[PDB]
Amino acid sequence: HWGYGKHNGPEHWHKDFPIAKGERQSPVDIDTHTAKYDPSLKPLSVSYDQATSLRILNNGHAFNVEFDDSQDKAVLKGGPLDGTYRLIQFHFHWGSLDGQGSEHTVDKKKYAAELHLVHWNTKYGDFGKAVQQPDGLAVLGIFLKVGSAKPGLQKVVDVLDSIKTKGKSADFTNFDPRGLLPESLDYWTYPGSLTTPPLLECVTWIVLKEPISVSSEQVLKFRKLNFNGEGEPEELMVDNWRPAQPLKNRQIKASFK
Numbered sequence: 001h002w003g004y005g006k007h008n009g010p011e012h013w014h015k016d017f018p019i020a021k022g023e024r025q026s027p028v029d030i031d032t033h034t035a036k037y038d039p040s041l042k043p044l045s046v047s048y049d050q051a052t053s054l055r056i057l058n059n060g061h062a063f064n065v066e067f068d069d070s071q072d073k074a075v076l077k078g079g080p081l082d083g084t085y086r087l088i089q090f091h092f093h094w095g096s097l098d099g100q101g102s103e104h105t106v107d108k109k110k111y112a113a114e115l116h117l118v119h120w121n122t123k124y125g126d127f128g129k130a131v132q133q134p135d136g137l138a139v140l141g142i143f144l145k146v147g148s149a150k151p152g153l154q155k156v157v158d159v160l161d162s163i164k165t166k167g168k169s170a171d172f173t174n175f176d177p178r179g180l181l182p183e184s185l186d187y188w189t190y191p192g193s194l195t196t197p198p199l200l201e202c203v204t205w206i207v208l209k210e211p212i213s214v215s216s217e218q219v220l221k222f223r224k225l226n227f228n229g230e231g232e233p234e235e236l237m238v239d240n241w242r243p244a245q246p247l248k249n250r251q252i253k254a255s256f257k
């Protein structure tokens, strides 16, 4: 099966998932000089006041913090989007070293990590349906640099010891994802895909310009997770990012000048 190793990593994925070589793959490099300001874009609307977190799961390639998406509770709207998108989960991608780990890059700069807040378009009724549609998902991507600690991340960091290995989960109620956002909601947007198999071309990407800062100790703790299951040889969960893919016939739009 697929993963992030020499023998099953991103260069291999196309054998099982040929859309790996498709026309709207993610992530991409964001060339800031070529992205055009689009004054027709709206401010984003991030409405997380009623978000209801449930659980945190090590799924063997990241950890997902899962939300109750059975009603409109935590929704993303505006920006480039038509309609209402419901938060289902967030996760991260990160490196073995502070100088790598993001999936998107900015003028070829790699950040230490990247947060993905995953939302599905309510007009399609459920996530499973939405992922089959070109406008099914909206993923809010936020870069992480290493510097000062992010206080709102610490509850995440503290639970990781209890989900060390693939298949483990833990209660994760009453977590407020507002505490992971930067000050500014300035963003880039473009049409793309899931960054993990099955690589479905269903995502409107919204990538915030302002990174959040986390401490070296917070990211060190991410790197103590395991890709393996319990009782199996230990494989540290690091460098779980896909590299930048060809832009092809796409424009990246800026919400700001």
Ligand SMILES: NS(=O)(=O)c1ccc(-c2cn(-c3cccc4ccccc34)nn2)s1
Residues within 6 Å of the ligand: 116, 118, 131, 139, 193, 194, 195, 196, 197, 198
């Ligand atoms: N990294 S990402 O934000 O692009 C992302 C957000 C959501 C993803 C995802 C992958 N999924 C799947 C996993 C395994 C099998 C699946 C089969 C069909 C559809 C999605 C599948 N479901 N959501 S990947």
Ligand code: NA
Residues within 6 Å of the ligand: 070, 071
């Ligand atoms: Na419900």
Ligand SMILES: [Zn+2]
Residues within 6 Å of the ligand: 091, 092, 093, 116, 195
């Ligand atoms: Zn992701």
